Design a protein around this nucleic acid. Structure first.
Ligand SMILES: [Mg+2]
Length: 580
DNA sequence: GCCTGACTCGC
DNA sequence: GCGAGTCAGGCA
Protein backbone atom coordinates (compact mmCIF):
# COMPACT_ATOMS: atom_id res chain seq x y z
CA UNK A 1 0.00 0.00 0.00
CA UNK A 2 3.12 2.20 0.18
CA UNK A 3 2.77 5.16 -2.24
CA UNK A 4 5.34 5.58 -5.00
CA UNK A 5 7.87 8.43 -4.64
CA UNK A 6 11.47 9.35 -5.32
CA UNK A 7 13.59 9.73 -2.19
CA UNK A 8 16.01 12.19 -3.76
CA UNK A 9 19.54 12.82 -2.50
CA UNK A 10 19.77 15.94 -4.73
CA UNK A 11 17.54 18.59 -6.38
CA UNK A 12 16.76 18.11 -10.08
CA UNK A 13 15.08 20.40 -12.56
CA UNK A 14 11.87 18.35 -12.91
CA UNK A 15 11.17 19.12 -9.22
CA UNK A 16 11.12 22.84 -10.04
CA UNK A 17 7.91 22.77 -12.13
CA UNK A 18 5.80 25.91 -12.30
CA UNK A 19 2.89 24.15 -10.57
CA UNK A 20 3.36 21.89 -7.54
CA UNK A 21 2.05 20.77 -4.17
CA UNK A 22 4.67 21.71 -1.56
CA UNK A 23 5.02 20.54 2.00
CA UNK A 24 7.60 22.18 4.26
CA UNK A 25 7.07 20.30 7.51
CA UNK A 26 7.50 22.10 10.81
CA UNK A 27 6.39 19.72 13.56
CA UNK A 28 6.92 21.90 16.63
CA UNK A 29 3.69 23.60 17.61
CA UNK A 30 5.48 26.92 17.71
CA UNK A 31 7.15 27.31 14.32
CA UNK A 32 9.30 30.38 15.18
CA UNK A 33 13.00 29.47 14.73
CA UNK A 34 11.78 25.85 14.56
CA UNK A 35 13.25 23.01 12.51
CA UNK A 36 12.06 21.98 9.04
CA UNK A 37 12.11 18.15 9.31
CA UNK A 38 11.47 17.28 5.64
CA UNK A 39 10.24 18.46 2.26
CA UNK A 40 7.93 16.89 -0.25
CA UNK A 41 7.08 18.06 -3.77
CA UNK A 42 4.33 16.65 -5.96
CA UNK A 43 3.94 17.82 -9.56
CA UNK A 44 3.16 16.52 -13.06
CA UNK A 45 6.62 14.87 -13.16
CA UNK A 46 5.97 12.86 -10.01
CA UNK A 47 6.34 12.71 -6.26
CA UNK A 48 9.60 13.66 -4.55
CA UNK A 49 10.95 13.73 -1.00
CA UNK A 50 13.88 16.03 -0.24
CA UNK A 51 15.90 16.51 2.90
CA UNK A 52 16.03 20.07 4.30
CA UNK A 53 19.84 20.26 4.56
CA UNK A 54 20.01 19.28 0.88
CA UNK A 55 17.04 21.26 -0.48
CA UNK A 56 17.42 24.48 1.52
CA UNK A 57 21.16 24.69 0.63
CA UNK A 58 20.42 24.36 -3.12
CA UNK A 59 20.46 27.71 -5.02
CA UNK A 60 18.09 26.38 -7.68
CA UNK A 61 15.52 25.14 -5.17
CA UNK A 62 15.64 28.32 -3.04
CA UNK A 63 15.19 30.48 -6.14
CA UNK A 64 12.16 28.32 -7.07
CA UNK A 65 10.68 28.85 -3.57
CA UNK A 66 11.13 32.59 -3.98
CA UNK A 67 9.85 32.82 -7.56
CA UNK A 68 6.29 34.21 -7.45
CA UNK A 69 5.62 32.94 -11.00
CA UNK A 70 6.16 29.43 -9.66
CA UNK A 71 2.82 28.40 -8.21
CA UNK A 72 2.53 26.35 -5.03
CA UNK A 73 -0.30 24.57 -3.22
CA UNK A 74 0.10 24.01 0.49
CA UNK A 75 -1.55 23.40 3.81
CA UNK A 76 -0.84 26.17 6.36
CA UNK A 77 1.58 28.15 4.19
CA UNK A 78 2.12 30.76 6.94
CA UNK A 79 3.81 28.10 9.08
CA UNK A 80 6.22 27.22 6.31
CA UNK A 81 6.75 30.83 5.28
CA UNK A 82 7.74 31.97 8.82
CA UNK A 83 10.00 28.99 9.54
CA UNK A 84 11.77 29.64 6.20
CA UNK A 85 12.05 33.29 7.15
CA UNK A 86 14.11 32.43 10.25
CA UNK A 87 16.42 30.66 7.80
CA UNK A 88 16.56 33.72 5.55
CA UNK A 89 14.45 32.23 2.74
CA UNK A 90 11.36 33.77 1.15
CA UNK A 91 8.34 31.71 0.17
CA UNK A 92 6.43 33.05 -2.84
CA UNK A 93 3.86 31.75 -5.28
CA UNK A 94 1.28 30.23 -2.95
CA UNK A 95 -1.92 30.24 -5.06
CA UNK A 96 -3.90 27.83 -2.85
CA UNK A 97 -3.91 27.07 0.90
CA UNK A 98 -5.93 23.98 1.85
CA UNK A 99 -6.17 24.97 5.56
CA UNK A 100 -7.74 28.31 4.70
CA UNK A 101 -9.97 26.85 1.96
CA UNK A 102 -11.31 24.25 4.43
CA UNK A 103 -11.83 27.05 6.96
CA UNK A 104 -13.91 29.20 4.60
CA UNK A 105 -16.08 26.21 3.58
CA UNK A 106 -16.95 25.17 7.13
CA UNK A 107 -15.14 26.57 10.19
CA UNK A 108 -17.13 24.17 12.40
CA UNK A 109 -15.16 21.12 11.20
CA UNK A 110 -12.07 22.40 13.00
CA UNK A 111 -9.70 21.24 10.28
CA UNK A 112 -6.16 21.24 11.81
CA UNK A 113 -4.37 18.82 9.50
CA UNK A 114 -4.43 17.71 5.89
CA UNK A 115 -6.20 14.43 6.78
CA UNK A 116 -9.18 16.30 8.30
CA UNK A 117 -9.53 18.55 5.25
CA UNK A 118 -9.25 15.51 3.00
CA UNK A 119 -12.08 13.66 4.75
CA UNK A 120 -14.49 16.40 3.67
CA UNK A 121 -14.10 15.17 0.07
CA UNK A 122 -14.06 11.44 0.93
CA UNK A 123 -10.25 11.21 0.62
CA UNK A 124 -8.64 8.98 3.25
CA UNK A 125 -5.30 8.06 1.63
CA UNK A 126 -3.45 10.25 4.16
CA UNK A 127 -2.77 9.78 7.89
CA UNK A 128 -3.52 12.40 10.54
CA UNK A 129 -0.40 14.09 11.96
CA UNK A 130 -1.37 12.94 15.49
CA UNK A 131 -1.20 9.33 14.23
CA UNK A 132 2.29 9.82 12.76
CA UNK A 133 3.99 12.20 15.17
CA UNK A 134 2.03 11.06 18.22
CA UNK A 135 0.98 13.51 20.95
CA UNK A 136 2.06 14.96 24.28
CA UNK A 137 5.38 13.79 25.74
CA UNK A 138 5.36 10.85 23.25
CA UNK A 139 5.39 13.30 20.29
CA UNK A 140 8.39 12.29 18.18
CA UNK A 141 9.60 12.71 14.60
CA UNK A 142 9.61 9.21 13.07
CA UNK A 143 12.27 7.57 10.92
CA UNK A 144 12.95 8.79 7.40
CA UNK A 145 10.99 6.06 5.57
CA UNK A 146 7.82 6.79 7.58
CA UNK A 147 8.24 10.61 7.66
CA UNK A 148 8.87 10.75 3.90
CA UNK A 149 5.89 8.51 3.14
CA UNK A 150 3.65 10.77 5.22
CA UNK A 151 4.76 14.07 3.65
CA UNK A 152 4.35 12.75 0.09
CA UNK A 153 0.84 11.61 1.00
CA UNK A 154 -0.08 15.07 2.29
CA UNK A 155 1.36 16.59 -0.87
CA UNK A 156 -0.60 14.18 -3.10
CA UNK A 157 -3.70 15.07 -1.07
CA UNK A 158 -3.17 18.81 -1.63
CA UNK A 159 -2.53 18.07 -5.30
CA UNK A 160 -5.80 16.08 -5.62
CA UNK A 161 -8.00 18.29 -3.44
CA UNK A 162 -7.16 21.73 -4.88
CA UNK A 163 -9.70 21.41 -7.66
CA UNK A 164 -12.71 20.18 -5.64
CA UNK A 165 -12.16 22.77 -2.88
CA UNK A 166 -11.98 25.68 -5.33
CA UNK A 167 -15.13 24.38 -7.02
CA UNK A 168 -17.22 24.44 -3.82
CA UNK A 169 -15.70 27.84 -2.94
CA UNK A 170 -16.78 29.04 -6.39
CA UNK A 171 -20.36 27.75 -5.85
CA UNK A 172 -20.41 29.50 -2.46
CA UNK A 173 -19.08 32.77 -3.94
CA UNK A 174 -16.08 32.37 -1.61
CA UNK A 175 -13.38 32.09 -4.27
CA UNK A 176 -12.33 35.78 -4.18
CA UNK A 177 -12.63 35.60 -0.40
CA UNK A 178 -9.82 33.05 -0.38
CA UNK A 179 -7.59 34.33 -3.21
CA UNK A 180 -8.00 38.06 -2.44
CA UNK A 181 -8.50 38.22 1.34
CA UNK A 182 -7.46 35.23 3.41
CA UNK A 183 -4.36 34.12 1.45
CA UNK A 184 -2.89 37.61 0.99
CA UNK A 185 -3.62 38.22 4.68
CA UNK A 186 -1.57 35.09 5.45
CA UNK A 187 1.51 36.76 4.02
CA UNK A 188 0.89 39.97 5.95
CA UNK A 189 0.41 38.07 9.22
CA UNK A 190 3.60 36.13 8.50
CA UNK A 191 5.65 39.36 8.36
CA UNK A 192 3.96 40.63 11.55
CA UNK A 193 4.76 37.48 13.45
CA UNK A 194 8.35 37.41 12.17
CA UNK A 195 8.89 41.10 12.99
CA UNK A 196 7.65 40.56 16.52
CA UNK A 197 7.11 43.14 19.24
CA UNK A 198 9.92 44.45 21.43
CA UNK A 199 9.45 43.99 25.22
CA UNK A 200 11.00 45.94 28.05
CA UNK A 201 11.85 42.93 30.22
CA UNK A 202 13.35 45.09 32.96
CA UNK A 203 10.13 47.03 33.28
CA UNK A 204 8.15 43.75 33.47
CA UNK A 205 10.59 42.41 36.10
CA UNK A 206 10.37 45.43 38.38
CA UNK A 207 6.57 45.20 37.98
CA UNK A 208 6.65 41.54 39.04
CA UNK A 209 8.74 42.65 42.03
CA UNK A 210 6.01 45.12 43.09
CA UNK A 211 3.19 42.57 42.76
CA UNK A 212 5.26 39.91 44.53
CA UNK A 213 5.62 42.17 47.55
CA UNK A 214 1.93 43.15 47.46
CA UNK A 215 0.70 39.56 47.11
CA UNK A 216 2.75 38.68 50.19
CA UNK A 217 1.18 41.46 52.27
CA UNK A 218 -2.30 40.38 51.03
CA UNK A 219 -1.64 36.62 51.35
CA UNK A 220 -0.78 37.05 55.05
CA UNK A 221 -3.78 39.30 55.73
CA UNK A 222 -6.00 36.59 54.28
CA UNK A 223 -4.54 33.93 56.63
CA UNK A 224 -4.87 36.13 59.73
CA UNK A 225 -8.54 36.67 58.96
CA UNK A 226 -8.92 32.99 58.08
CA UNK A 227 -7.04 32.18 61.28
CA UNK A 228 -5.00 29.64 59.30
CA UNK A 229 -3.09 28.91 56.09
CA UNK A 230 -4.67 27.35 52.99
CA UNK A 231 -4.03 27.45 49.25
CA UNK A 232 -5.96 30.56 48.22
CA UNK A 233 -5.66 29.50 44.58
CA UNK A 234 -7.69 26.34 45.25
CA UNK A 235 -11.43 27.02 44.78
CA UNK A 236 -12.17 23.87 46.80
CA UNK A 237 -10.07 24.99 49.83
CA UNK A 238 -11.32 28.59 49.69
CA UNK A 239 -14.92 27.41 49.57
CA UNK A 240 -14.35 25.48 52.81
CA UNK A 241 -12.90 28.54 54.56
CA UNK A 242 -15.56 30.92 53.27
CA UNK A 243 -18.70 28.81 53.40
CA UNK A 244 -17.98 26.43 56.30
CA UNK A 245 -15.57 28.04 58.79
CA UNK A 246 -16.91 31.60 58.35
CA UNK A 247 -20.46 30.39 57.55
CA UNK A 248 -20.86 32.79 54.64
CA UNK A 249 -24.09 32.64 52.59
CA UNK A 250 -24.01 30.30 49.61
CA UNK A 251 -25.39 32.43 46.75
CA UNK A 252 -24.36 30.22 43.78
CA UNK A 253 -23.31 26.61 43.28
CA UNK A 254 -20.94 24.81 40.94
CA UNK A 255 -21.28 21.25 39.74
CA UNK A 256 -17.93 20.72 41.43
CA UNK A 257 -18.91 22.58 44.61
CA UNK A 258 -19.39 26.09 45.99
CA UNK A 259 -18.97 29.02 43.58
CA UNK A 260 -16.13 31.45 44.46
CA UNK A 261 -16.55 33.74 41.42
CA UNK A 262 -15.81 37.49 41.74
CA UNK A 263 -19.47 38.36 41.05
CA UNK A 264 -20.48 36.08 43.95
CA UNK A 265 -17.70 37.37 46.24
CA UNK A 266 -18.59 40.97 45.43
CA UNK A 267 -21.90 40.39 47.28
CA UNK A 268 -20.27 38.56 50.21
CA UNK A 269 -17.91 41.44 51.02
CA UNK A 270 -20.21 43.04 53.65
CA UNK A 271 -20.21 39.84 55.78
CA UNK A 272 -16.48 39.47 56.33
CA UNK A 273 -13.22 41.40 55.80
CA UNK A 274 -11.53 38.37 54.24
CA UNK A 275 -13.62 38.73 51.08
CA UNK A 276 -12.18 42.01 49.71
CA UNK A 277 -8.64 40.82 50.37
CA UNK A 278 -9.33 37.64 48.34
CA UNK A 279 -10.63 39.66 45.41
CA UNK A 280 -7.55 41.86 45.61
CA UNK A 281 -5.30 38.79 45.80
CA UNK A 282 -6.85 37.15 42.75
CA UNK A 283 -6.49 40.19 40.50
CA UNK A 284 -2.88 40.76 41.64
CA UNK A 285 -2.27 37.03 41.16
CA UNK A 286 -4.02 37.07 37.80
CA UNK A 287 -1.84 39.94 36.72
CA UNK A 288 1.36 38.34 38.06
CA UNK A 289 0.92 34.81 36.68
CA UNK A 290 -0.84 35.41 33.33
CA UNK A 291 0.71 38.68 32.20
CA UNK A 292 4.06 39.12 33.93
CA UNK A 293 5.41 35.57 34.29
CA UNK A 294 3.51 34.37 31.19
CA UNK A 295 4.87 37.18 29.05
CA UNK A 296 8.49 36.84 30.32
CA UNK A 297 8.45 33.14 29.53
CA UNK A 298 7.64 33.68 25.80
CA UNK A 299 10.04 36.64 25.24
CA UNK A 300 13.02 35.54 23.18
CA UNK A 301 16.26 36.38 25.02
CA UNK A 302 18.07 36.97 21.70
CA UNK A 303 15.74 39.42 19.90
CA UNK A 304 14.18 40.54 23.20
CA UNK A 305 10.84 40.37 21.32
CA UNK A 306 7.58 38.40 21.46
CA UNK A 307 6.66 36.52 18.28
CA UNK A 308 2.99 35.61 18.44
CA UNK A 309 1.23 33.09 16.21
CA UNK A 310 -2.10 34.22 14.81
CA UNK A 311 -4.55 31.43 14.16
CA UNK A 312 -6.42 32.46 11.00
CA UNK A 313 -8.53 29.31 10.83
CA UNK A 314 -10.09 28.75 14.28
CA UNK A 315 -13.09 30.97 15.04
CA UNK A 316 -16.58 30.56 13.62
CA UNK A 317 -16.89 34.38 13.39
CA UNK A 318 -13.85 34.94 11.13
CA UNK A 319 -11.74 36.80 13.69
CA UNK A 320 -8.01 36.22 14.12
CA UNK A 321 -6.75 34.55 17.26
CA UNK A 322 -3.40 34.99 18.99
CA UNK A 323 -1.26 32.54 21.02
CA UNK A 324 2.14 32.45 22.79
CA UNK A 325 1.47 35.07 23.68
CA UNK A 326 -2.11 36.12 23.29
CA UNK A 327 -1.78 39.85 22.82
CA UNK A 328 -5.52 40.29 22.32
CA UNK A 329 -6.31 40.18 26.06
CA UNK A 330 -3.68 42.51 27.58
CA UNK A 331 -5.20 44.41 30.56
CA UNK A 332 -6.77 47.83 29.91
CA UNK A 333 -9.71 48.71 32.22
CA UNK A 334 -7.84 48.69 35.55
CA UNK A 335 -4.96 51.12 35.86
CA UNK A 336 -2.79 48.53 37.68
CA UNK A 337 -3.42 46.19 34.73
CA UNK A 338 -3.05 48.81 31.96
CA UNK A 339 0.55 49.45 32.93
CA UNK A 340 1.49 46.09 31.36
CA UNK A 341 1.31 47.88 28.02
CA UNK A 342 4.27 50.02 29.02
CA UNK A 343 6.41 46.89 28.56
CA UNK A 344 5.70 46.81 24.82
CA UNK A 345 8.06 49.22 23.11
CA UNK A 346 9.27 50.14 19.61
CA UNK A 347 11.81 47.81 17.96
CA UNK A 348 14.27 50.60 17.12
CA UNK A 349 15.47 53.84 18.68
CA UNK A 350 13.64 57.03 17.59
CA UNK A 351 10.59 54.95 16.70
CA UNK A 352 7.14 55.17 18.18
CA UNK A 353 4.17 52.86 18.63
CA UNK A 354 1.06 53.80 16.63
CA UNK A 355 -2.46 52.47 17.35
CA UNK A 356 -5.62 53.03 15.29
CA UNK A 357 -9.02 51.59 16.20
CA UNK A 358 -12.53 51.49 14.79
CA UNK A 359 -15.15 53.24 16.92
CA UNK A 360 -18.17 50.98 17.39
CA UNK A 361 -17.62 49.09 14.08
CA UNK A 362 -19.98 46.31 15.13
CA UNK A 363 -22.89 48.61 15.85
CA UNK A 364 -22.20 50.49 12.59
CA UNK A 365 -22.30 47.24 10.63
CA UNK A 366 -25.60 46.43 12.39
CA UNK A 367 -27.02 49.73 11.22
CA UNK A 368 -25.90 48.85 7.69
CA UNK A 369 -27.22 45.27 7.53
CA UNK A 370 -30.45 46.08 9.44
CA UNK A 371 -31.01 49.45 7.76
CA UNK A 372 -32.58 50.80 10.92
CA UNK A 373 -33.37 54.45 10.22
CA UNK A 374 -32.77 55.60 13.77
CA UNK A 375 -29.50 53.73 14.23
CA UNK A 376 -28.18 54.96 10.88
CA UNK A 377 -29.11 58.57 11.76
CA UNK A 378 -27.34 58.19 15.09
CA UNK A 379 -23.98 57.22 13.46
CA UNK A 380 -24.40 59.78 10.68
CA UNK A 381 -24.59 62.38 13.46
CA UNK A 382 -21.67 60.66 15.18
CA UNK A 383 -23.61 60.61 18.44
CA UNK A 384 -22.47 58.80 21.57
CA UNK A 385 -24.37 55.60 20.72
CA UNK A 386 -24.68 54.50 24.35
CA UNK A 387 -26.08 57.88 25.49
CA UNK A 388 -28.42 57.90 22.49
CA UNK A 389 -29.62 54.37 23.25
CA UNK A 390 -30.22 55.48 26.83
CA UNK A 391 -32.28 58.50 25.55
CA UNK A 392 -34.57 56.27 23.52
CA UNK A 393 -35.21 53.30 25.79
CA UNK A 394 -35.81 55.62 28.79
CA UNK A 395 -37.71 58.35 26.83
CA UNK A 396 -35.70 61.22 28.29
CA UNK A 397 -33.47 64.04 27.07
CA UNK A 398 -29.68 64.11 27.01
CA UNK A 399 -29.61 66.22 30.16
CA UNK A 400 -31.74 63.56 31.81
CA UNK A 401 -29.42 60.60 31.13
CA UNK A 402 -28.01 59.53 34.48
CA UNK A 403 -24.71 57.54 34.61
CA UNK A 404 -26.59 54.36 35.55
CA UNK A 405 -29.07 54.89 32.68
CA UNK A 406 -26.04 54.99 30.35
CA UNK A 407 -24.27 51.97 31.88
CA UNK A 408 -27.41 49.86 31.35
CA UNK A 409 -27.97 51.05 27.78
CA UNK A 410 -24.28 50.16 27.20
CA UNK A 411 -24.89 46.62 28.51
CA UNK A 412 -27.82 46.18 26.07
CA UNK A 413 -25.67 47.29 23.12
CA UNK A 414 -22.94 44.94 24.35
CA UNK A 415 -25.47 42.07 24.46
CA UNK A 416 -26.17 42.72 20.80
CA UNK A 417 -22.51 43.03 19.74
CA UNK A 418 -21.60 39.70 21.40
CA UNK A 419 -24.94 37.88 21.14
CA UNK A 420 -25.62 37.22 24.83
CA UNK A 421 -28.89 35.73 26.15
CA UNK A 422 -31.48 37.66 28.12
CA UNK A 423 -30.23 35.43 30.94
CA UNK A 424 -26.82 36.86 30.10
CA UNK A 425 -28.00 40.46 30.14
CA UNK A 426 -29.65 40.04 33.52
CA UNK A 427 -26.51 38.63 35.13
CA UNK A 428 -24.50 41.51 33.74
CA UNK A 429 -26.97 44.09 34.98
CA UNK A 430 -27.57 42.30 38.28
CA UNK A 431 -31.28 42.31 37.52
CA UNK A 432 -34.16 39.87 37.07
CA UNK A 433 -34.62 37.96 33.82
CA UNK A 434 -38.06 39.47 33.29
CA UNK A 435 -36.85 43.07 33.52
CA UNK A 436 -33.94 42.22 31.26
CA UNK A 437 -36.43 40.96 28.70
CA UNK A 438 -38.31 44.19 29.25
CA UNK A 439 -35.24 46.21 28.34
CA UNK A 440 -34.84 44.36 25.07
CA UNK A 441 -38.44 44.87 23.99
CA UNK A 442 -37.89 48.50 24.86
CA UNK A 443 -34.78 48.67 22.67
CA UNK A 444 -36.70 47.07 19.77
CA UNK A 445 -39.43 49.71 20.00
CA UNK A 446 -36.74 52.35 19.58
CA UNK A 447 -34.90 50.25 16.96
CA UNK A 448 -37.56 48.51 14.81
CA UNK A 449 -35.10 47.72 12.00
CA UNK A 450 -32.79 45.69 14.25
CA UNK A 451 -35.75 43.69 15.61
CA UNK A 452 -36.69 43.16 11.97
CA UNK A 453 -33.14 42.05 11.15
CA UNK A 454 -33.04 39.62 14.11
CA UNK A 455 -36.33 38.04 13.05
CA UNK A 456 -35.33 37.87 9.38
CA UNK A 457 -31.84 36.52 9.96
CA UNK A 458 -33.03 33.68 12.18
CA UNK A 459 -35.54 32.76 9.53
CA UNK A 460 -32.86 32.75 6.84
CA UNK A 461 -30.56 30.60 8.94
CA UNK A 462 -33.41 28.10 9.27
CA UNK A 463 -34.15 28.23 5.54
CA UNK A 464 -30.59 27.98 4.14
CA UNK A 465 -28.75 26.26 7.02
CA UNK A 466 -26.18 29.03 7.40
CA UNK A 467 -25.64 32.78 7.69
CA UNK A 468 -23.12 34.87 5.74
CA UNK A 469 -21.01 37.98 6.32
CA UNK A 470 -20.50 41.06 4.17
CA UNK A 471 -17.61 39.48 2.29
CA UNK A 472 -19.26 36.04 1.94
CA UNK A 473 -17.87 34.27 5.00
CA UNK A 474 -20.22 31.53 6.10
CA UNK A 475 -21.41 29.83 9.25
CA UNK A 476 -23.62 26.76 9.45
CA UNK A 477 -26.28 26.51 12.13
CA UNK A 478 -27.69 22.96 12.39
CA UNK A 479 -28.94 23.50 15.93
CA UNK A 480 -31.25 26.23 14.66
CA UNK A 481 -33.93 23.54 14.25
CA UNK A 482 -33.06 21.85 17.52
CA UNK A 483 -35.93 20.98 19.81
CA UNK A 484 -33.97 21.80 22.95
CA UNK A 485 -34.39 25.40 24.15
CA UNK A 486 -30.87 26.38 25.30
CA UNK A 487 -29.35 24.73 22.22
CA UNK A 488 -31.80 26.39 19.81
CA UNK A 489 -31.37 29.78 21.53
CA UNK A 490 -27.61 29.73 21.17
CA UNK A 491 -27.99 28.92 17.46
CA UNK A 492 -30.44 31.77 16.97
CA UNK A 493 -28.04 34.20 18.74
CA UNK A 494 -25.11 33.05 16.61
CA UNK A 495 -27.36 33.58 13.57
CA UNK A 496 -27.98 37.12 14.78
CA UNK A 497 -24.43 37.77 15.88
CA UNK A 498 -22.15 36.29 13.21
CA UNK A 499 -23.16 38.57 10.35
CA UNK A 500 -22.38 41.53 12.63
CA UNK A 501 -19.22 40.09 14.20
CA UNK A 502 -18.09 38.33 11.03
CA UNK A 503 -18.48 41.34 8.77
CA UNK A 504 -16.40 43.47 11.16
CA UNK A 505 -13.71 40.78 10.98
CA UNK A 506 -14.01 40.99 7.20
CA UNK A 507 -13.49 44.77 7.20
CA UNK A 508 -10.43 44.83 9.45
CA UNK A 509 -8.85 42.07 7.35
CA UNK A 510 -9.38 44.03 4.11
CA UNK A 511 -8.01 47.14 5.87
CA UNK A 512 -4.86 45.24 6.80
CA UNK A 513 -4.38 44.34 3.14
CA UNK A 514 -5.14 47.85 1.94
CA UNK A 515 -2.87 49.40 4.59
CA UNK A 516 0.03 47.12 3.66
CA UNK A 517 -0.31 48.13 0.00
CA UNK A 518 -0.36 51.82 0.90
CA UNK A 519 2.56 51.61 3.27
CA UNK A 520 4.54 50.14 0.43
CA UNK A 521 3.31 52.68 -2.13
CA UNK A 522 4.17 55.57 0.21
CA UNK A 523 7.65 54.14 0.86
CA UNK A 524 7.15 54.23 4.62
CA UNK A 525 9.32 52.14 6.94
CA UNK A 526 6.28 51.79 9.22
CA UNK A 527 5.02 48.24 9.86
CA UNK A 528 2.05 46.32 11.20
CA UNK A 529 2.86 44.64 14.49
CA UNK A 530 -0.49 43.47 15.92
CA UNK A 531 -4.16 43.14 15.36
CA UNK A 532 -6.48 43.14 18.40
CA UNK A 533 -9.98 42.83 16.98
CA UNK A 534 -10.89 46.45 16.57
CA UNK A 535 -7.47 47.97 16.28
CA UNK A 536 -4.21 47.83 14.34
CA UNK A 537 -0.93 48.52 16.15
CA UNK A 538 2.07 49.74 14.18
CA UNK A 539 5.57 50.94 14.87
CA UNK A 540 7.37 53.56 12.82
CA UNK A 541 10.02 56.33 12.98
CA UNK A 542 8.77 59.53 14.68
CA UNK A 543 9.20 61.31 11.35
CA UNK A 544 6.32 59.22 9.95
CA UNK A 545 3.74 59.85 12.73
CA UNK A 546 2.23 62.94 11.10
CA UNK A 547 1.81 61.09 7.78
CA UNK A 548 0.35 57.96 9.44
CA UNK A 549 -2.13 60.02 11.44
CA UNK A 550 -3.61 61.11 8.17
CA UNK A 551 -2.89 57.86 6.28
CA UNK A 552 -3.79 54.94 8.54
CA UNK A 553 -7.30 56.16 9.54
CA UNK A 554 -8.11 56.90 5.85
CA UNK A 555 -7.27 53.31 4.76
CA UNK A 556 -9.29 51.77 7.61
CA UNK A 557 -12.28 54.01 6.91
CA UNK A 558 -12.32 53.39 3.12
CA UNK A 559 -11.87 49.61 3.32
CA UNK A 560 -15.53 49.10 2.56
CA UNK A 561 -18.35 51.57 1.97
CA UNK A 562 -21.43 51.20 4.13
CA UNK A 563 -24.67 53.10 4.70
CA UNK A 564 -23.03 54.72 7.68
CA UNK A 565 -19.55 56.16 7.99
CA UNK A 566 -16.72 54.23 9.60
CA UNK A 567 -14.83 56.01 12.34
CA UNK A 568 -11.23 55.45 13.33
CA UNK A 569 -9.38 56.87 16.33
CA UNK A 570 -5.58 56.98 16.49
CA UNK A 571 -2.86 57.70 19.06
CA UNK A 572 0.86 57.24 19.47
CA UNK A 573 3.54 57.20 22.10
CA UNK A 574 6.78 55.82 23.49
CA UNK A 575 4.97 52.63 24.55
CA UNK A 576 1.74 50.82 23.52
CA UNK A 577 0.30 52.11 26.80
CA UNK A 578 1.16 55.66 25.80
CA UNK A 579 -0.82 55.26 22.57
CA UNK A 580 -4.07 56.07 24.44
C1' DG B 1 1.68 13.00 32.54
C1' DC B 2 -3.31 13.57 31.27
C1' DC B 3 -8.03 15.80 31.38
C1' DT B 4 -11.27 18.75 33.51
C1' DG B 5 -13.46 22.22 35.64
C1' DA B 6 -13.25 26.92 37.81
C1' DC B 7 -11.76 31.36 37.28
C1' DT B 8 -10.36 35.65 34.80
C1' DC B 9 -8.74 38.88 31.01
C1' DG B 10 -9.80 41.57 26.37
C1' DC B 11 -12.85 41.84 22.61
C1' DG C 1 -20.74 35.04 24.49
C1' DC C 2 -15.44 33.68 22.74
C1' DG C 3 -10.86 32.56 22.95
C1' DA C 4 -6.36 32.16 25.69
C1' DG C 5 -4.10 30.82 29.87
C1' DT C 6 -3.19 29.54 34.78
C1' DC C 7 -3.94 26.62 38.60
C1' DA C 8 -5.67 22.42 41.27
C1' DG C 9 -7.27 18.14 41.94
C1' DG C 10 -8.47 13.66 40.36
C1' DC C 11 -6.97 10.24 37.11
C1' DA C 12 -3.97 5.96 34.07
MG1 LIG D 1 -12.23 50.63 19.98
Amino acid sequence: AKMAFTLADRVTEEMLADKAALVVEVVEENYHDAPIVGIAVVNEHGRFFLRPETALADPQFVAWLGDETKKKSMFDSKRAAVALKWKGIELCGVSFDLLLAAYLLDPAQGVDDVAAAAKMKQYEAVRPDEAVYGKGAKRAVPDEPVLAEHLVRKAAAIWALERPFLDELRRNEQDRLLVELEQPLSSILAEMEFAGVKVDTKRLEQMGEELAEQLRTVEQRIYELAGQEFNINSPKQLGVILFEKLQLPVLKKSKTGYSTSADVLEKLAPYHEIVENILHYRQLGKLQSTYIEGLLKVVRPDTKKVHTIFNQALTQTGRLSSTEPNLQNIPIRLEEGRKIRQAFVPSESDWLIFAADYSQIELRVLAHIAEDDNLMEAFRRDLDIHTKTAMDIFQVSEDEVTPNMRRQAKAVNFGIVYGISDYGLAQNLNISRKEAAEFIERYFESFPGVKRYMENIVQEAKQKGYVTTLLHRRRYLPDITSRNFNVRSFAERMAMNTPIQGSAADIIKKAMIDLNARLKEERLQARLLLQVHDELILEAPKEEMERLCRLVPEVMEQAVTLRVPLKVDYHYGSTWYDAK
